[PDB]
Design a binder for these strands. Sequence first.
RNA 1: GAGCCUUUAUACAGUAAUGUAUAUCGAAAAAUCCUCUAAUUCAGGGAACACCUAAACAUGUAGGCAAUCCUGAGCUAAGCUCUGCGGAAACGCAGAGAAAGUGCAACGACUAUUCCGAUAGGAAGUAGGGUCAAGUGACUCGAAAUGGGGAUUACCCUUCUAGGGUAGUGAUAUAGUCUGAACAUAUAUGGAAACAUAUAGAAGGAUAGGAGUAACGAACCUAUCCGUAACAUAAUUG
RNA 2: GCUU
Lengths: 367, 367
Amino acid sequence: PKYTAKINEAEENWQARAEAIKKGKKQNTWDLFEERGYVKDTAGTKEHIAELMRTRRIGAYVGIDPTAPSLHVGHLLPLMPLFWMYLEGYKAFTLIGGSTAKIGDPTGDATMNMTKIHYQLKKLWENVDTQMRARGYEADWARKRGIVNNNHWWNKQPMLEVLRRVGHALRIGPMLSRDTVKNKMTQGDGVSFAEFTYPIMQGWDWFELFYQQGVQMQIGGSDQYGNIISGLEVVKAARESEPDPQERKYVTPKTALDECVGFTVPLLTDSSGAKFGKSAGNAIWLDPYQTSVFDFYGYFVRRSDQEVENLLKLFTFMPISEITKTMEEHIKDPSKRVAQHTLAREVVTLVHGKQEASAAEDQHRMM
Amino acid sequence: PKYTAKINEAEENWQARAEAIKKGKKQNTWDLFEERGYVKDTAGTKEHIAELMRTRRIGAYVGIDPTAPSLHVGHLLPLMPLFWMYLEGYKAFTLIGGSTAKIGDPTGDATMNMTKIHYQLKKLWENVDTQMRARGYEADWARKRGIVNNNHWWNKQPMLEVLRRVGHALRIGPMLSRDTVKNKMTQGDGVSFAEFTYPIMQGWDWFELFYQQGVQMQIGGSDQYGNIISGLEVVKAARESEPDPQERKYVTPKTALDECVGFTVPLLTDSSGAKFGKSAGNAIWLDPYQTSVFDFYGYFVRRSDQEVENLLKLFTFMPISEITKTMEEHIKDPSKRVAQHTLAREVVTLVHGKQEASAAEDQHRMM
RNA sequence: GAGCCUUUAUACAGUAAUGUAUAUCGAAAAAUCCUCUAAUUCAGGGAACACCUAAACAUGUAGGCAAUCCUGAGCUAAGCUCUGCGGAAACGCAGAGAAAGUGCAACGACUAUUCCGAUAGGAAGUAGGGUCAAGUGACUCGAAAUGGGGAUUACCCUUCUAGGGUAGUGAUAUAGUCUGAACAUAUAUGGAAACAUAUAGAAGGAUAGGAGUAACGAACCUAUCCGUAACAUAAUUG
RNA sequence: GCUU
């Protein structure tokens, strides 16, 4: 139909792009991730990954365990590179763990929570867009974002399906041997069949997104590597055992590049020692009635000049080009901290919109 | 309603019989069990299972995975006691693993494979019922038999629920400490996620049966012992997990009577140090066009002059009483196989009808 | 809406009327009698209405409800066919089967009566219920095959008096009695909701016992769980 | 033409 018409039209567009990158005419979204520091580890030839990106209009996602009734800054890290991918035209999504929470990542009223979170996420996009169009970005039809909920399928997802479609492929070996969890049995109480299986699901999720949305990438927590790997395995397993001949033409690991890869953003902390996201005790929440807009503006303007550089490139949607401009201005007057007042205002916008974020500057820049 | 009064009828009688055992008048089903040597191991108190069988028309089943196109003579023994219970007036079942086959018990097309067994169990049951009334057995309203496919439910069993309804109380520790496993990892190969779950499955199955009919007792192969244990585990957590309380009022283990016990038949192997089912050129099946009636008949007519005894108790619904009589004629002439004919015939007749029982004996009676 | 037959069309089927198949159609229908009504459970899969809901997903969907199409296990009244024994006959017993019914009523419970009528129904007051009394009393309702099996009939066909075929679905509840069914409810689990399931609802109600009986019942005695919030209400609906 |  006419719908398929625009689809193929997009392919070409994405090729003029794949071209520019070929002759370094435009940076590779991947080398963009290296330019702001979003790469800690990689489950997929750092290089390969790159090509897979310059080339195809791939997709990715970021999962969030709806355990808290609000996300905190610590989640903003991994969502950034996603966002960027979005700004380029890829297919990005944010998977909510509505069901997974019920088990929880064994790394080491529930509705009410799950609910809030959803909305909390859409809001961001609502701003990422406003931001995207504003900071000078072009309208791409094919471009694709969205919010999913692992429950959507897991709620009825029969076990026979899973246990068979992949159960024969995995082996408790590189599972029970997994340090993160294995360590839990030794140095801990132990583990519930749920926990042991949690990964397995995290992998059925990745696949679901591939099978249901063409996802060849997953961005996650620094500690989520051990998971991103195990997921992978599960991903493929299903693609392999596709008992459908006409559907094998899809899912089955065709071309070499047709491989799902991922990358764990780095684990950050404050110039001192306190882990990132936490503050004295709790954390830098996002929920206004739990972290006033002011306080928010605070933990950001707080960061000293030692990190402002590395952390400025991490949480702002600003061309490193213009970044060094703000930084080169700040360094000629560290005391006044022009760079700290700006970086803070910038991130408060994205999450809390300009209108407020601007007023919030008045408070903290007053007296 | 009338139907109501009916269930009550059989109920009352059950107490009359509960008394006979209480005042020595009829062997408690379970005594007839350990007596005819059907028992080798037990999960629950020897007296526990006793009392329960005195005051409860409990339900019990025998699991059978359709991995082969025919039930081999081995599958008899385990079923045998079951049949007896049906005879005494219980709730007995035979479970078909039409889905668990893609997994199988770990220890060390296919669609029709199952079909074959279906038709089987049936026809068999028929004769069981047949011989029953055939020999002074008064039917009972409450006495019921039946077969049930395991896919019956697995076909669409929600992963989420399951995992929760029991995973939150199961540790992969002891679940992996079962030797059956440790070996299937150290020695030999490895243990997949799938097969790892078989123990849980067979456990759930039980739960089902306990729910859909009132089956609170498993009867498995001499080796299936472990499963009988790992299974019972899932069983408990299940009756607890039940969300709606009102239901819990029934489904949850209230008094010590609502205790589900399971026992395992012995390991019966021929005087050939080989399972009593993996002998001959490969095995000894029931399928006529896979094991000549004659050849079958033989498997019995020829057996240890000593074995006859305990072999009659295990494969013939012959009253202990005249069972010894057969031993009277036999000993007057060891090499005459007087008892071997009677014990051989029984088996054939049971799994092949009287008409054949004779026809076979004839061939095995020539010059 | 859906099914039945029905108009016509083709199609595989036959000795042929006719048979099965899809679609179209509606122009008149759609024989009688007798006998059986037991079992009444455990799941499973699908579904027209446009019929409520709208949390997701980009009105499209989706979940619910549902006329209702079925499958597995078990069970079942009188017959049915194969084989074995009995018989003179019947039928009997045995086993192998082949229909068919529960399952598959508005959540269910319960019953297969006479008379008259072209029917709808009318009269009986049986079957079996409801209410009040307390005792074997009053009062008030009040009735089904539309299936299974066996006959008879008429019909036309005929490889033409001997076979063959045609004489509709309707019971996933029909009659009818009840009714926790009916509540946009209360409650509790499950859902975002619509809902589904379980109790309960004009302080009582429910089940399991004690006693006592000729037996059931009223009333007593024990325990138990439900409410103790307003509606349940009378037509009316399966 | 009838039917739940």
